[PDB]
């Protein structure tokens, strides 16, 4: 049926309209490249206002997500994935940092179940028991895992065949040619493909070196790349 | 309001994800947070003009034109009124967002966030109008709307009276967080550590600090290279490593 099956465990399934109703994610859902389902732990509660948080053992601020509701939603999602190999990922700052390399890897999966936490987190025993991998979108703290989940799905969905390198991007220009006495680089106005390719590559290399030299220390460069970057540096004020 | 945020995006209605749900929503209600959106497609020259156009020199995709973005930003700037607004473009070429960066961003009176789409925005717009470029991580998304929402969420957490606790979470003390436990005492033949059931407040503090240190050491030793260890922290971490088994 679909290339990527995603099940999201979240108490705010309504938030995932941002990727289901918009962009390539929406387009992939309609094309059937991407199957997106939501599983509200709040529905697998058996009480008052469908409470899914409790007070933490040992005290402290905040609340913790109870096991029982989470258990429900995850069991349902696992069933819903069928005979697909589903990786269960918890979105948390304690997880492995998401990078483009990590995204390419994640795009090879046939099914993902994403747990979005709220409050202080979920019970460590749930994680021990049910979670295959922990992923972080960066070294900052968000109020929940819904946005991280959606970030992950967006990045991964981009790489799916028929949806649409360690360098930063070149600058981009479009109409008009001149705007408030700021003209577009001449090289992009000459129809020459080879000059344009060389200039963009060099600008990419230059910006990478200027702002993210760490990306250059990981990736070894081609001979042409070394020359173009050298020329960039030596010809800059 | 304490924080005024204006978002420049061609999908303003996508921001219902933070305006209608979670602490961002309740911060808006409470009046800590003002959230506004500005669709550049409504600021074009005429209504037969798209916000995007073909990239000069070719290449895949389209680029966002400067005229629409310039209009929307003028409107947002005007709306922010007396406030010092910082104009942020969400880009992979930006500064890496970290919790330190978030604390700093939460001291601003007003933020105007430009969410690009397609290949990006015209470089001349950035050159002229953008104060700061921020990246939420080293990966490529289809647009800046989710990055913008990430930024607003993180910042809104630090607004006095928004909420867990903002001064006890991960990255605050340079460490990862400890594990958390709640009812029941035993689940799937796994018990809550006794320290959290019977222990005093000193035992629990020391236990949580040790777990923090241990998890950081296991998963994120790079964090420990930047923040030094004290004598007590080295002993607690040594003990963690030797009792890992
Ligand atoms: O990089 C692209 N688009 C960007 C343009 C500027 C704003 N968008 C964005 C922001 C981010 C981002 C922001 C903050 N932190 C991490 C990523 N990723 N992508 C979308 C891009 C889209 C695209 C489509 C086909 C071929 C090449 C392509 N490149
Ligand atoms: C506010 S957090 C608290 C997490 C935990 N107490 C800590 O500080 O490490 C609650 C939820 O937000 C989500 N979250 C926060 N920051 C995240 C990030 N950088 N990446 C992925 N998920 C995140 C997690 O799903 C987490 O369960």
Coordinates of C-alpha atoms and ligand atoms in Angstrom, one line a residue:
Chain A
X1 CA 0.0 0.0 0.0
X2 CA 2.1 3.0 1.3
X3 CA 5.9 3.5 1.5
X4 CA 5.9 4.9 5.0
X5 CA 3.4 4.2 7.7
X6 CA 3.5 6.6 10.7
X7 CA 1.5 6.2 13.9
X8 CA 1.8 9.0 16.4
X9 CA 0.9 8.7 20.0
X10 CA -0.2 12.1 21.2
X11 CA -2.9 13.7 23.5
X12 CA -3.1 16.5 20.9
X13 CA -3.8 14.6 17.6
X14 CA -5.4 17.9 16.2
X15 CA -1.9 19.5 16.1
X16 CA -0.8 17.0 13.3
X17 CA -3.0 19.0 10.9
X18 CA 0.1 21.1 10.3
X19 CA 1.6 18.1 8.4
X20 CA -1.5 16.4 7.2
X21 CA -3.1 19.5 5.7
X22 CA 0.1 21.2 4.4
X23 CA 3.1 20.8 2.3
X24 CA 4.8 17.6 0.9
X25 CA 3.5 15.7 4.0
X26 CA -0.1 16.4 2.9
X27 CA 0.8 15.7 -0.7
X28 CA 2.4 12.4 0.2
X29 CA -0.7 11.4 2.2
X30 CA -3.0 12.1 -0.8
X31 CA -0.5 10.4 -3.1
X32 CA -0.5 7.4 -0.6
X33 CA 3.3 7.6 -0.1
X34 CA 2.6 8.4 3.5
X35 CA 0.0 6.9 5.9
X36 CA -0.5 9.0 9.0
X37 CA -2.6 7.9 12.0
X38 CA -2.9 9.3 15.5
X39 CA -3.5 7.6 18.8
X40 CA -4.8 9.6 21.7
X41 CA -3.7 8.1 25.1
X42 CA -6.6 10.2 26.5
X43 CA -9.0 7.8 24.8
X44 CA -7.4 4.7 26.5
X45 CA -8.1 6.0 30.0
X46 CA -11.0 4.7 32.1
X47 CA -12.0 7.6 34.3
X48 CA -13.1 11.2 35.0
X49 CA -11.7 13.7 32.4
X50 CA -9.5 11.0 30.8
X51 CA -6.5 11.9 33.0
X52 CA -3.1 10.7 31.5
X53 CA -0.7 12.3 33.9
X54 CA 0.2 11.6 37.6
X55 CA 2.4 13.1 40.3
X56 CA 6.1 12.0 40.2
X57 CA 7.5 9.5 42.8
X58 CA 10.0 11.3 44.9
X59 CA 8.2 14.6 44.4
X60 CA 9.6 17.5 42.4
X61 CA 7.8 19.9 40.1
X62 CA 5.4 18.8 37.3
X63 CA 3.6 15.7 36.4
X64 CA 4.5 12.4 34.5
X65 CA 2.6 10.6 31.8
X66 CA 1.0 7.4 33.2
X67 CA 1.9 4.0 31.7
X68 CA -1.7 2.7 31.3
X69 CA -3.0 5.3 28.7
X70 CA 0.3 5.2 26.7
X71 CA 0.2 1.4 26.8
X72 CA -3.3 1.5 25.2
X73 CA -2.5 3.8 22.4
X74 CA 0.8 2.0 21.5
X75 CA -0.9 -1.4 21.5
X76 CA -3.5 -0.1 19.1
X77 CA -0.9 1.6 16.8
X78 CA 1.2 -1.6 16.8
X79 CA -1.9 -3.6 15.7
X80 CA -2.7 -0.9 13.1
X81 CA 0.8 -1.3 11.5
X82 CA -0.1 -4.9 10.8
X83 CA 2.9 -7.0 9.6
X84 CA 5.1 -4.0 9.0
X85 CA 8.4 -3.7 10.8
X86 CA 7.6 -0.7 13.1
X87 CA 10.4 1.1 15.0
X88 CA 9.1 2.8 18.2
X89 CA 10.7 6.1 18.7
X90 CA 10.3 8.4 21.8
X91 CA 10.9 12.1 21.0
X92 CA 13.0 13.5 23.9
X93 CA 16.0 15.7 24.5
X94 CA 17.8 12.6 26.0
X95 CA 17.7 11.1 22.6
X96 CA 20.2 10.9 19.7
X97 CA 20.5 14.2 17.9
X98 CA 18.6 14.2 14.6
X99 CA 20.8 15.1 11.6
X100 CA 20.3 14.7 7.9
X101 CA 22.3 11.4 8.1
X102 CA 19.9 10.2 10.8
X103 CA 16.9 11.3 8.6
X104 CA 18.1 9.2 5.6
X105 CA 18.4 6.2 7.9
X106 CA 14.9 6.8 9.3
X107 CA 13.5 7.0 5.8
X108 CA 14.4 3.4 5.1
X109 CA 11.8 2.2 7.7
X110 CA 8.5 0.9 6.6
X111 CA 6.7 2.0 9.8
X112 CA 7.4 4.4 12.6
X113 CA 5.5 4.8 15.8
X114 CA 6.3 8.1 17.4
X115 CA 5.6 8.8 21.1
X116 CA 5.0 12.4 21.9
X117 CA 5.5 13.1 25.6
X118 CA 4.0 15.9 27.7
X119 CA 4.7 17.2 31.2
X120 CA 8.1 16.0 32.6
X121 CA 8.1 13.0 30.4
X122 CA 6.9 9.4 30.4
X123 CA 7.6 6.7 33.0
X124 CA 11.2 5.4 32.6
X125 CA 9.8 1.8 32.8
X126 CA 7.6 2.4 29.8
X127 CA 10.7 3.5 27.8
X128 CA 12.8 0.5 29.1
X129 CA 10.0 -1.8 27.9
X130 CA 8.4 -0.4 24.7
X131 CA 10.8 2.2 23.1
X132 CA 13.3 1.0 20.5
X133 CA 15.1 4.4 19.9
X134 CA 15.2 7.9 21.5
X135 CA 15.6 10.9 19.1
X136 CA 16.1 14.6 19.8
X137 CA 15.6 17.4 17.3
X138 CA 18.0 19.7 19.2
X139 CA 19.5 20.8 22.6
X140 CA 16.5 22.8 23.8
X141 CA 13.3 21.9 25.7
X142 CA 9.8 22.0 24.3
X143 CA 6.5 21.7 26.1
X144 CA 5.8 18.4 24.3
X145 CA 6.9 16.0 21.5
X146 CA 4.3 16.9 18.9
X147 CA 6.4 19.5 17.1
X148 CA 9.6 17.3 17.2
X149 CA 7.5 14.4 15.8
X150 CA 6.2 16.6 13.0
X151 CA 9.8 17.9 12.3
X152 CA 11.0 14.3 12.0
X153 CA 8.1 13.3 9.7
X154 CA 8.6 16.4 7.4
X155 CA 12.4 15.8 7.0
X156 CA 11.9 12.0 6.4
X157 CA 9.0 12.5 4.0
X158 CA 11.1 14.8 1.8
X159 CA 13.4 11.8 1.0
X160 CA 10.6 9.4 0.0
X161 CA 10.9 8.5 -3.7
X162 CA 8.6 10.8 -5.8
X163 CA 7.8 13.1 -3.0
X164 CA 9.6 16.2 -4.4
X165 CA 25.6 16.6 1.3
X166 CA 27.3 18.2 4.4
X167 CA 27.4 21.7 2.8
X168 CA 25.4 24.8 3.5
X169 CA 23.3 26.3 0.7
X170 CA 24.2 29.0 -1.8
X171 CA 22.3 32.3 -1.9
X172 CA 19.1 32.4 -4.0
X173 CA 17.8 35.2 -6.2
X174 CA 14.6 35.8 -8.2
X175 CA 12.7 38.7 -9.8
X176 CA 13.3 41.4 -10.2
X177 CA 16.9 41.7 -11.6
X178 CA 17.4 45.0 -9.7
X179 CA 15.6 45.9 -6.5
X180 CA 16.4 49.2 -4.6
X181 CA 19.8 49.3 -6.4
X182 CA 20.6 45.8 -5.4
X183 CA 21.3 43.7 -8.5
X184 CA 21.4 39.9 -8.8
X185 CA 24.9 38.5 -9.4
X186 CA 25.8 38.7 -13.2
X187 CA 26.8 35.0 -13.3
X188 CA 23.2 34.0 -12.7
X189 CA 22.0 36.2 -15.6
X190 CA 24.5 34.8 -18.1
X191 CA 23.0 31.5 -19.4
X192 CA 26.2 29.7 -18.8
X193 CA 25.6 26.5 -16.8
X194 CA 29.2 25.7 -15.9
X195 CA 30.0 29.2 -14.5
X196 CA 26.7 29.1 -12.5
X197 CA 27.5 25.6 -11.1
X198 CA 31.0 26.7 -10.1
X199 CA 29.8 30.0 -8.5
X200 CA 27.0 28.3 -6.4
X201 CA 29.4 25.6 -5.3
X202 CA 32.0 28.2 -4.2
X203 CA 29.4 30.3 -2.4
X204 CA 28.1 27.1 -0.6
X205 CA 31.7 26.3 0.4
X206 CA 32.4 29.9 1.5
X207 CA 29.3 30.2 3.7
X208 CA 30.0 26.7 5.2
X209 CA 33.5 27.8 6.0
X210 CA 32.3 31.2 7.4
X211 CA 29.5 29.9 9.7
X212 CA 29.9 26.0 10.0
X213 CA 33.6 25.1 9.7
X214 CA 32.7 22.0 11.8
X215 CA 30.9 20.6 8.7
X216 CA 34.2 21.0 6.7
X217 CA 36.2 19.2 9.3
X218 CA 34.0 16.1 8.9
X219 CA 33.6 16.0 5.1
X220 CA 36.9 15.8 3.1
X221 CA 36.7 18.1 0.0
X222 CA 37.5 17.5 -3.7
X223 CA 40.4 19.2 -5.5
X224 CA 38.0 21.6 -7.3
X225 CA 36.3 22.2 -3.9
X226 CA 39.6 23.1 -2.2
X227 CA 40.5 25.5 -5.0
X228 CA 37.1 27.2 -5.1
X229 CA 37.1 27.6 -1.2
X230 CA 40.7 28.9 -1.2
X231 CA 39.7 31.5 -3.9
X232 CA 36.7 32.5 -1.9
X233 CA 38.7 33.2 1.3
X234 CA 41.6 35.0 -0.4
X235 CA 39.3 37.2 -2.5
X236 CA 37.2 38.4 0.5
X237 CA 37.7 41.6 2.5
Chain B
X1 CA 1.8 41.1 26.9
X2 CA 5.3 40.1 27.8
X3 CA 6.2 38.5 24.4
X4 CA 4.9 39.7 21.1
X5 CA 5.5 37.4 18.2
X6 CA 4.8 38.1 14.6
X7 CA 5.2 35.3 12.0
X8 CA 5.6 35.9 8.3
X9 CA 4.3 32.8 6.6
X10 CA 2.2 31.8 3.5
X11 CA 0.5 29.3 5.8
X12 CA -0.6 31.4 8.8
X13 CA -3.4 28.9 9.7
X14 CA -0.8 26.2 10.3
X15 CA 0.1 28.1 13.5
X16 CA -3.2 26.8 15.0
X17 CA -1.0 24.0 16.2
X18 CA 0.6 26.3 18.9
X19 CA -2.2 29.0 19.2
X20 CA -5.0 26.5 20.0
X21 CA -3.1 23.8 22.0
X22 CA -0.6 23.3 24.8
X23 CA 1.1 26.0 26.9
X24 CA 1.5 28.3 23.9
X25 CA -2.3 28.4 23.7
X26 CA -2.8 28.9 27.4
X27 CA 0.0 31.7 27.4
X28 CA -2.0 33.5 24.6
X29 CA -5.2 33.2 26.7
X30 CA -3.4 34.3 29.9
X31 CA -2.0 37.3 27.9
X32 CA 1.7 36.4 28.4
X33 CA 2.0 35.8 24.6
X34 CA 0.6 37.7 21.6
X35 CA 0.7 35.7 18.4
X36 CA 0.0 37.3 15.0
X37 CA 0.5 36.1 11.4
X38 CA 1.3 38.0 8.2
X39 CA 0.7 36.1 4.8
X40 CA 3.1 37.6 2.3
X41 CA 0.8 36.5 -0.6
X42 CA -1.6 39.4 0.4
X43 CA 1.3 41.9 0.0
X44 CA 2.3 41.2 -3.6
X45 CA 2.2 44.0 -6.3
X46 CA -1.2 42.8 -7.6
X47 CA -3.3 39.6 -7.2
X48 CA -2.0 38.1 -10.4
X49 CA 1.5 37.9 -8.9
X50 CA 2.6 34.8 -6.8
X51 CA 4.9 35.1 -3.8
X52 CA 7.4 32.8 -5.5
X53 CA 9.2 32.9 -8.9
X54 CA 11.8 31.0 -10.8
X55 CA 15.4 31.1 -9.5
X56 CA 17.9 33.2 -11.5
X57 CA 20.6 30.9 -13.0
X58 CA 18.1 28.0 -12.9
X59 CA 18.1 25.1 -10.5
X60 CA 15.3 23.1 -8.9
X61 CA 12.4 24.7 -7.1
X62 CA 11.2 28.3 -6.7
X63 CA 12.4 31.2 -4.6
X64 CA 10.4 33.7 -2.5
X65 CA 10.4 37.2 -3.9
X66 CA 11.5 40.2 -1.8
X67 CA 8.5 42.5 -2.5
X68 CA 5.9 40.4 -0.7
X69 CA 8.2 39.6 2.3
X70 CA 9.1 43.3 2.5
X71 CA 5.4 44.4 2.7
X72 CA 4.4 41.8 5.3
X73 CA 7.4 42.7 7.5
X74 CA 6.5 46.5 7.3
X75 CA 3.0 45.6 8.5
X76 CA 4.3 43.4 11.3
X77 CA 6.9 46.0 12.4
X78 CA 4.1 48.6 12.5
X79 CA 1.9 46.3 14.6
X80 CA 4.6 45.7 17.1
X81 CA 4.4 49.4 17.8
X82 CA 6.7 50.8 20.5
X83 CA 8.5 47.4 21.0
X84 CA 12.0 46.5 20.0
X85 CA 11.4 43.7 17.5
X86 CA 14.2 41.3 16.4
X87 CA 13.7 39.9 12.9
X88 CA 14.7 36.2 12.8
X89 CA 15.0 34.1 9.6
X90 CA 14.7 30.3 10.3
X91 CA 17.4 28.7 8.2
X92 CA 19.9 25.7 8.2
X93 CA 22.6 28.4 7.7
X94 CA 21.6 30.0 11.1
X95 CA 23.0 29.7 14.6
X96 CA 22.2 26.4 16.3
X97 CA 19.3 26.9 18.7
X98 CA 20.2 25.7 22.2
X99 CA 18.5 26.2 25.6
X100 CA 21.1 29.0 26.3
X101 CA 19.9 30.7 23.0
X102 CA 16.3 30.2 24.1
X103 CA 16.8 32.0 27.4
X104 CA 18.2 34.9 25.5
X105 CA 15.4 35.0 23.0
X106 CA 12.9 35.1 25.9
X107 CA 14.3 38.5 27.0
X108 CA 13.1 40.1 23.8
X109 CA 10.0 42.3 23.7
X110 CA 9.0 41.3 20.2
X111 CA 10.1 38.7 17.6
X112 CA 9.2 38.7 13.9
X113 CA 9.9 35.2 12.5
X114 CA 10.2 34.7 8.7
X115 CA 9.3 31.3 7.6
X116 CA 10.5 30.6 4.1
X117 CA 9.2 28.0 1.7
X118 CA 10.5 26.5 -1.6
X119 CA 14.3 27.0 -2.0
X120 CA 14.3 30.0 0.3
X121 CA 14.0 33.7 0.3
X122 CA 15.8 36.2 -1.9
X123 CA 19.3 36.8 -0.5
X124 CA 18.7 40.6 -0.8
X125 CA 15.8 40.4 1.7
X126 CA 18.1 38.7 4.2
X127 CA 21.0 41.1 3.6
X128 CA 18.7 44.1 4.3
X129 CA 16.1 43.1 6.9
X130 CA 17.1 40.0 8.9
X131 CA 18.7 40.6 12.3
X132 CA 19.4 36.9 13.3
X133 CA 19.4 33.6 11.5
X134 CA 18.6 30.5 13.7
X135 CA 18.6 26.8 12.9
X136 CA 16.7 24.2 15.0
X137 CA 19.0 21.5 13.8
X138 CA 21.2 20.1 11.0
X139 CA 18.5 18.7 8.8
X140 CA 16.4 20.0 5.9
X141 CA 12.7 20.6 6.2
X142 CA 10.2 21.8 3.5
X143 CA 9.6 25.1 5.3
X144 CA 10.3 27.3 8.3
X145 CA 6.8 27.0 9.9
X146 CA 7.7 24.1 12.2
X147 CA 11.1 25.7 13.2
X148 CA 9.2 28.9 14.0
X149 CA 6.7 27.0 16.1
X150 CA 9.6 25.1 17.9
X151 CA 11.2 28.5 18.7
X152 CA 7.9 30.0 20.0
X153 CA 7.2 26.9 22.1
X154 CA 10.6 26.8 23.7
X155 CA 10.6 30.5 24.5
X156 CA 7.0 30.5 25.8
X157 CA 8.0 27.9 28.4
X158 CA 10.4 30.4 30.1
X159 CA 7.7 33.1 30.4
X160 CA 7.0 33.9 34.1
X161 CA 3.9 31.9 35.0
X162 CA 3.6 29.9 31.8
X163 CA 3.9 26.5 33.5
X164 CA 7.4 20.8 34.7
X165 CA 9.8 23.6 35.7
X166 CA 11.9 25.8 33.4
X167 CA 15.0 25.9 35.7
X168 CA 15.1 22.0 36.3
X169 CA 14.8 20.6 32.7
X170 CA 17.6 19.3 30.4
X171 CA 20.5 21.5 29.3
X172 CA 19.9 24.0 32.1
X173 CA 22.8 22.9 34.3
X174 CA 24.7 21.5 31.3
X175 CA 23.3 18.0 32.0
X176 CA 20.5 15.7 30.7
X177 CA 17.5 15.0 32.9
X178 CA 17.0 12.2 35.4
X179 CA 14.4 9.5 34.7
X180 CA 10.8 10.0 36.0
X181 CA 8.5 7.5 37.7
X182 CA 4.8 7.5 38.7
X183 CA 2.1 5.0 39.7
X184 CA 2.1 2.1 40.0
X185 CA 5.0 1.0 42.3
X186 CA 5.6 -2.1 40.2
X187 CA 4.8 -2.5 36.5
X188 CA 5.9 -5.3 34.1
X189 CA 8.1 -6.8 36.9
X190 CA 9.9 -3.4 37.3
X191 CA 9.9 -1.5 40.5
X192 CA 10.3 2.2 41.2
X193 CA 13.8 2.8 42.7
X194 CA 13.4 2.6 46.5
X195 CA 15.2 6.0 47.0
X196 CA 12.1 7.8 45.5
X197 CA 9.7 5.9 47.8
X198 CA 11.4 5.9 51.2
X199 CA 14.3 8.3 50.8
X200 CA 14.7 11.8 52.2
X201 CA 15.0 14.9 50.1
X202 CA 18.9 14.9 50.2
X203 CA 19.0 11.2 49.1
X204 CA 16.7 12.0 46.2
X205 CA 18.6 15.2 45.1
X206 CA 21.8 13.2 45.1
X207 CA 20.2 10.2 43.3
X208 CA 18.7 12.5 40.6
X209 CA 22.0 14.3 40.1
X210 CA 23.9 11.0 39.7
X211 CA 21.3 9.8 37.1
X212 CA 21.6 13.1 35.3
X213 CA 25.4 12.8 35.2
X214 CA 25.3 9.1 34.3
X215 CA 22.8 9.5 31.4
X216 CA 24.8 12.5 30.1
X217 CA 28.0 10.4 30.3
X218 CA 26.3 7.5 28.4
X219 CA 24.6 9.5 25.7
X220 CA 26.1 13.1 25.6
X221 CA 29.7 13.1 26.9
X222 CA 30.2 16.3 24.7
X223 CA 28.0 18.1 27.2
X224 CA 30.5 17.0 30.0
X225 CA 33.5 18.3 28.0
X226 CA 32.0 21.8 28.0
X227 CA 30.6 21.9 31.6
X228 CA 33.3 20.7 34.1
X229 CA 32.6 18.2 36.9
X230 CA 32.9 19.1 40.6
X231 CA 34.5 16.7 43.1
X232 CA 31.1 15.4 44.3
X233 CA 29.9 15.1 40.7
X234 CA 33.1 13.1 39.7
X235 CA 32.5 10.7 42.7
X236 CA 28.8 10.3 41.9
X237 CA 29.6 9.7 38.2
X238 CA 32.4 7.2 39.0
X239 CA 29.9 5.3 41.3
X240 CA 27.3 5.4 38.5
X241 CA 29.7 3.9 35.9
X242 CA 30.8 1.2 38.3
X243 CA 27.2 0.2 39.3
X244 CA 26.0 0.4 35.6
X245 CA 25.9 -3.4 35.4
Ligands
LIG1 O1 16.2 24.0 1.8 C1 15.2 24.0 1.2 N1 14.0 24.9 1.5 C2 14.1 25.8 2.7 C3 14.1 27.2 2.4 C4 14.2 28.0 3.6 C5 13.3 27.6 4.8 N2 13.0 26.1 4.9 C6 13.7 25.3 5.8 C7 14.1 25.8 7.1 C8 14.8 24.7 7.6 C9 15.3 24.7 9.0 C10 15.2 25.8 9.8 C11 15.8 25.7 11.0 N3 16.4 24.6 11.4 C12 16.6 23.6 10.6 C13 16.0 23.6 9.3 N4 14.8 23.7 6.7 N5 14.2 24.1 5.7 C14 12.8 25.5 3.5 C15 15.0 23.2 -0.1 C16 13.8 22.7 -0.5 C17 14.0 22.0 -1.7 C18 13.2 21.3 -2.7 C19 13.8 20.7 -3.8 C20 15.2 20.8 -4.0 C21 16.0 21.5 -3.1 C22 15.4 22.1 -1.9 N6 16.0 22.8 -0.9
LIG2 C1 8.9 19.5 28.5 S1 9.5 18.0 28.2 C2 10.3 17.5 29.5 C3 11.3 16.4 29.2 C4 12.3 16.0 30.3 N1 11.7 16.4 31.7 C5 13.6 16.8 30.1 O1 13.7 17.9 30.6 O2 14.5 16.1 29.5 C6 8.1 17.0 27.9 C7 8.2 16.5 26.5 O3 8.6 17.4 25.6 C8 9.2 16.7 24.5 N2 10.5 17.3 24.1 C9 11.0 18.4 24.7 N3 12.1 18.8 24.0 C10 12.4 18.0 23.0 C11 13.4 17.8 22.0 N4 14.4 18.6 21.9 N5 13.3 16.8 21.1 C12 12.3 15.9 21.2 N6 11.3 16.0 22.2 C13 11.3 17.0 23.1 C14 9.5 15.2 25.0 O4 8.6 14.4 24.2 C15 9.1 15.3 26.5 O5 8.5 14.1 26.9

